[PDB]
Amino acid sequence: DLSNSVFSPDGRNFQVEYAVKAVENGTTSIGIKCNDGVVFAVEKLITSKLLVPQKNVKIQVVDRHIGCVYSGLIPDGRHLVNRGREEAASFKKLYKTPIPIPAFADRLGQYVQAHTLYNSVRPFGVSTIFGGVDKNGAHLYMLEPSGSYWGYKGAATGKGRQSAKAELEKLVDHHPEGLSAREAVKQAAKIIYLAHEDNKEKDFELEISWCSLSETNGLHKFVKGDLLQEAIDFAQKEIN
Amino acid sequence: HITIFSPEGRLYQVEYAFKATNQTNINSLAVRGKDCTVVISQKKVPDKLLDPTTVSYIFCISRTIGMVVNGPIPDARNAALRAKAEAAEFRYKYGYDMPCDVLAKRMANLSQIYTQRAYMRPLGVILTFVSVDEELGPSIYKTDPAGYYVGYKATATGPKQQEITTNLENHFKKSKIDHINEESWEKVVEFAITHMIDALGTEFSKNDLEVGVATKDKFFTLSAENIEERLVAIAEQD
Amino acid sequence: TTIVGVKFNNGVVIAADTRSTQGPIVADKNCAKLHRISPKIWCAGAGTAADTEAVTQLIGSNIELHSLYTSREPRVVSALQMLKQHLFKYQGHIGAYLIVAGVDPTGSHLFSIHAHGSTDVGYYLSLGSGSLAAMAVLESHWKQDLTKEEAIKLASDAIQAGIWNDLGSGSNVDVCVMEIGKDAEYLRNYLTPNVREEKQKSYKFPRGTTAVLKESIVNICD
Amino acid sequence: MDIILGIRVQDSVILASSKAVTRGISVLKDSDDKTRQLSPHTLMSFAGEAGDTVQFAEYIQANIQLYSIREDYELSPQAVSSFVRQELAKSIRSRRPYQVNVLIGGYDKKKNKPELYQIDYLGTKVELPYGAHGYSGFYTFSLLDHHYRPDMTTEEGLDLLKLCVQELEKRMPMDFKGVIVKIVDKDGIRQVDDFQAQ
Amino acid sequence: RYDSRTTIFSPEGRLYQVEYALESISHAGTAIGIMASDGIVLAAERKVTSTLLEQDTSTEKLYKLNDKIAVAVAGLTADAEILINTARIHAQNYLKTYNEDIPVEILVRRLSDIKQGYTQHGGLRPFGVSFIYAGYDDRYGYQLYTSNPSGNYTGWKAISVGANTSAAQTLLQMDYKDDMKVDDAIELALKTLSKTTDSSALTYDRLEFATIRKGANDGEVYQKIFKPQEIKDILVKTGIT
Amino acid sequence: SDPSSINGGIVVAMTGKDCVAIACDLRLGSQSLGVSNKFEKIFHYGHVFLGITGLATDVTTLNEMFRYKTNLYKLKEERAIEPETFTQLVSSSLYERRFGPYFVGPVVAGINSKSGKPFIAGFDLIGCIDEAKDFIVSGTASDQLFGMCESLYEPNLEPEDLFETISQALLNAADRDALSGWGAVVYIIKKDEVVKRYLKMRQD
Amino acid sequence: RYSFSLTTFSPSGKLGQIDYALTAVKQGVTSLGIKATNGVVIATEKKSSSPLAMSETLSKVSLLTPDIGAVYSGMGPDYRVLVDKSRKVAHTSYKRIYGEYPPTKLLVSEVAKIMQEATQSGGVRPFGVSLLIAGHDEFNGFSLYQVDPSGSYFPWKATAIGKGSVAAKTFLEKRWNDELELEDAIHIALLTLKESVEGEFNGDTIELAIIGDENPDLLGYTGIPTDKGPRFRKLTSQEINDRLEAL
Amino acid sequence: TSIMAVTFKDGVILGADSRTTTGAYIANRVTDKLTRVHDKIWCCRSGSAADTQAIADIVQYHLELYTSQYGTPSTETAASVFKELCYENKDNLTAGIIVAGYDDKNKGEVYTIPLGGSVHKLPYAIAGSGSTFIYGYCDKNFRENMSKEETVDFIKHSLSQAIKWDGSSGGVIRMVVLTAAGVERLIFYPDEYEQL
Ligand SMILES: [Mg+2]
Ligand SMILES: [Mg+2]
Ligand SMILES: [Mg+2]
Ligand SMILES: [Mg+2]
């Protein structure tokens, strides 16, 4: 059970489970596919008053149209992003047309894939949420340590995933036609707050980004500024 | 433990590998038409937060070759890719499109090589390739992780193998031929779903399943809607 | 160097002379410009001799290994693609032009590859120095759908064209035939127009004309 | 080119080799030995490209001496020359060939007879009764074809050679500044140093 | 520090790894080589027996290495063939370079040096073979050499290796006059060989032979790997049914 | 600027009823200056024969290279290399160095110890095979040789006569070629026995 | 447990893994071959996983060259790929150097050379298969050969490997003489193969081929004297069961 | 050499001759200069024979491989693929190559990858040995998009005059119709265009 390559008496790779186990342990991240485009949010945890606010960004863009976030082992996340960054930019130089989200995941999945094959390497310790647009709409997926990922209507990992899960459950049925681009944000703003109630004694800072042909204009922009505030307050009222 | 002979020459990592293929939990069956071929696989979507489009265990390798795999999605997408490119490289290097039976060879070959040289852990998936080539027509060959392939007149992969099997076997001792007598695919499709429902003591809606069809050089995945209409077809006629 | 190929209603035929030059000199009065790639796929090649041979040898060699492994059968374009991929990988440095032709489990086939990587197709192709005479012959006597007899008759009469009006080619005719269902027959020297006439005098010398200084009986094995 | 001669006789071999060294116009040293004893009974004279020459010789030498103490047994003239030819053979198709010609004189102790091998930079060897690389042959070869006898004493040889020299002087454009002569025999090597006063 | 790995050194400067292999020899067919002031003899007893095995259009004990040198194997069949091959090559490079026949001493040495090579590096195990080298070169005449997997070679007057070569060994020490012409040796060979056998008796089929000889009438050296017949016969000459 | 033409030399072979013959000159020299008259272009590997013309070192290097390989063949196969077989080999060998070609003109000939069939071949510096049933010529005076052979070859001569013919063919073509001569030698290959002969010629 | 597992010398001299490889051999399917004065025969049982697999697409006796075929007993997969490389080496290291195809002995040795590599080297487990290669060549005549994962090989008159070897090797031992013609052998093969079965005994469930004589038909071409045809003959499902008559 | 491709209302169609010359001689007066890379993506080769031929083969490969994972590719997505090949090797390549393809969405696009590697989306492009005399006609007699049959004439007459003054280019004409409908294989025998 101790090496990364090996199988258990009935076909099982434990190192990957623990990988998963550490992904849960970290902060919580989410994302939501709406009308056109997507919306992401993470949980920066202010451990002291000596942390400059609006600073240590956990969310990252890829190319100029792909939002991206995760949770678990922070350096592992960052690393994985770089690879995704090359692959993107190389493809782009080659086919000219900005990279289709559908395949992108694979390029990554295939890379996360490898780190489950050899013993000399360590399994990727992060679950990753992301999405963006293109011609045939916006998409959103979520990659785990096993390398297996899929497309979701909205995703979640890190500490309290259920909170946001059952929370994402509702939205589905009342808005079975995709939630409004705008409301998507402010709604995400809330879904986070609700899921934070574990690190409750410890304050925090919420970060949000999104994509949309109407709002962002095909791009991925950081939800910061005015819309950012009201989206909080919006959460602050329902926070009772 | 590790990849080098047991005392009875049976290096288990290869054996262990198998359970995991199975472990996924889905049933895959396949049968030949007369001018087409078909495979059945279940499409169990638990999490109400996913998207059924993104789900599948069958992919379009080539213009005419499709593939189904009873096994863990990460390892599958891999096999999918390599294979998908071996054929891509072939047509180029040789002038004619690569047939079923062959891909399954370099494929088994590949998994053998790994296994013997130790350059990685075997993927825990069984690949079931389908198509129809104008040299042997309706073709069906399967491959396992212990690097090995062979032929089937109709096969199955799953937690419940022999059940799906025995039925077909009995249906074959009678039909006596080594395939399915019938002209239309719609009709064959109907037939398999039939032989599976009966084989599970279970019923499927129009999304609970997953099926593919290999034609006269134009392989296509069966989609959500068309899929249902076959249940319409095979309801009264039963 | 003078060759051609013409496919008929049920196959294809390639023919080539038997003379190999060397500047103004005749090196081989009987050479076979017709080589076997595989039972049903054969080649005729002009230009640089050692190049044309070794290359088919190579390809024939691999195509065999392929068919075996694939358990199927040699496709013609398989051979073509193999040739021109390697052939051009060496940007021209391997002078060998040739008429590749055979039959696969899908039809009769005929192509022509240049030394650089160029490949063409038609119903009849001619490569070599006397490529012009044998071309002109085929460009007046050709009609779609010819038979084992019509086509043959023609191919050999085109080669004959070069043999006479072009210097770089001569002696006998070599022919090979592939039929869409039947085998392949190698007819080394289907013709023999050029034959030396009986000499005038007998030049055999009377034993002991050559002066010898020494002699012995050299060794061989252990 | 320079002057390199050699002649096999009775129970010995003799090597002549001019002494001058030239750099385009002026003549630097003029008392330069173009020789290099490979082993107690083997010897090699040489002429060739300025740098190529002296490097190669020593390099060959190295290998031999190496072989000779390793084995403790000495190597035969025949085999030696075989090796030298080997090296040059490769040298010629190397990214850069050592342009050098040579004469190899030795006394094969097993046969108790003297052997002489001429070898050009292309890797062309031949056992000969006598030879000379470059233009050197033209002027002399005749006189040798003429007076040479296999039975000649060591002295007989010198006289002959001496005459070949007098000629090379008389009809050669270049001033080779004389010659250094040397003898290989059952006793080993010694230098006819006397060829200045002689 | 015990058994495993060749790169290991036991507290007393022993290389077990080797000492096992160097001993593994005691499992192979009894091969013998003897020197005479006129010829060298290589005698060997076959192994792997049954009744359905040819051996005529082949061998696996006596291999001709050079027109002037021969060797008697006694180890791993798989191993031997590899060395035998590169031993042949190198011998030819010597010829191609010096244009002369390669001296036995030299050849034995280089081989012993490869066997030794595998005796000191990680990632490889030593060869488990032993060789009786027999040959001639005009440098030191006739020569009988031997080498184990430890990479050590040796000059012998007459030696044996493989099975019972302690028993077989001593029998030799008795009868051996330094000059002892060849036939007395070829004879002695069997005498020594018979005495050390688990077969009910010595049968030609299960046996391999060869000799080396040179002279004034040959002017050069001639060696013969004996064919099935000659043997079935000379056996009778030494008084065997 | 031709290499082949630097050293000189020629070689010719013919097939008789149940036997063969092959001869060559003896001269070796850098262009004008004649150097040796004991340089032989014909050797063998057991019962197989090879004549090589062209560039001197390359000749020597080849002999060595072939002696080497035939020894290694005969060893693992417990049988000497066969003619037809050798041909196919020396052929491939020449080619392996097709971009740094050996400047030579080989010619093989012998008697197959199974069929008993006489054999002759010729090649260009890269290994192109010229199978012939009468004669083979290579070297400086290639053209002069074809002039002789064409007149003198007579299908199936008696060994004693074939000698006389080939001898005269070689011998005479050699005098109209300025770069070949200084003696010659001819071998006569019978099923068993073989006879080597040196002949007398102009030494200019 | 022991000093087994790994590529290194056991105290006596016994090389570890190797023997366990020769275990996947003994456990494997039963197979035989007989050299017989004017032909040679090789055969093996075709024990089908299930009747749903059209076993008709998996050779056990495979063609190495138009004069040599071989067979196995042990790890199916090892034999499949081992073959293809084996075929290439018979080309790259022989036919492309000589113009023709290699004699039995050498091709075997060449296969053995590869069987070797897998051993002398940590990081690679040897092959779990022993091969029976039968062939012929103009100078050595008919040949029979066995090849173990230990690289080594031997020249046989006839033999078997696999489950039913102890037994078969005894039955064959009885029934052998040096004058038997091929059909004698072919016949004799079946009768040995007879016992060694647990399943059926019809056509499609027995894999056998043999090296016999030139098949001027099979070529596809005609016009070249010396090029006459392969000797390797894989008997098909039909030709077989008919010979079941004379038992 | 004489090729081109023109866009219109139903998409785009590309046509070229058949004549290929080695020196002043006709190697194969019946060349299929129009080449297929994908179902709705083709191209017409200009300049070097051996080179153009091989480029295609490679591209055909990339695309036929693209699809198997990234769905069906654009017409721009294809041009860029030639851009790379053409550019990187500008030193050992001679290629005039014109690319054309259609997609229901963006209609049919025309891109020309002339020698050097410079790429261009134009209304229509024209390259090949004899393009030199139709700079007069083409440009002048060009209405913005036409009809299936209406367009077939630009092609017909542009191609006709090019034979009339440029020997290195001739033979028969061949067109390839790329539309919503599908591919249609045209061919206009001699005695026709000459008459015009
Ligand atoms: Mg590993
Ligand atoms: Mg010549
Ligand atoms: Mg002369
Ligand atoms: Mg024109």
Note down, in words, how this protein is organized.
The structure is cut from a larger assembly and holds eight protein chains of eight kinds. Chain D has four helices and twelve strands, in the order ββββββααββββααββ. By secondary structure, chain D is α+β, with helices and mostly antiparallel strands. Chain D has one domain (about 1-200): 4-Layer Sandwich (Glutamine Phosphoribosylpyrophosphate, subunit 1, domain 1), CATH 3.60.20.10. In chain D, strands 10-1-2-11-12 form a five-stranded antiparallel β-sheet, with helices on one face. Chain D has a five-stranded antiparallel β-sheet with strand order 5-6-7-8-9, with helices on one face. Chain D has a two-stranded antiparallel sheet with strand order 3-4. Chain E has about 240 residues and is an alpha+beta fold. Chain E has a single domain (about 1-240), classed as 4-Layer Sandwich (Glutamine Phosphoribosylpyrophosphate, subunit 1, domain 1), CATH 3.60.20. Chain F has helices spanning about 5, 55-75, 85-95, 140-150, 160-175; strands at about 10-15, 20-25, 25-30, 35, 40-45, 50-55, 105-110, 120-125, 130, 135-140, 185-190, 195-200. In chain F, helix 4 (about 140-150) runs antiparallel to helix 5. Chain G has about 250 residues and is an alpha+beta fold. Chain G has a single domain, classed as Aminohydrolase, N-terminal nucleophile (Ntn) domain (Glutamine Phosphoribosylpyrophosphate, subunit 1, domain 1, 4-Layer Sandwich), CATH 3.60.20.10. Chain G contains six helices and eleven strands. Chain G has a five-stranded antiparallel β-sheet. A five-stranded antiparallel β-sheet of chain G has the order 3-4-5-6-7. The interface between E and G is medium-sized, with 30 and 35 residues. Strand 11 of chain C pairs antiparallel with strand 12 (about 195-200) of chain F. The structure holds magnesium ion (4 copies). One magnesium ion binds near residues 174, 175, 177, 180 and 181 of chain F. Chain H: Its main location: cytoplasm.
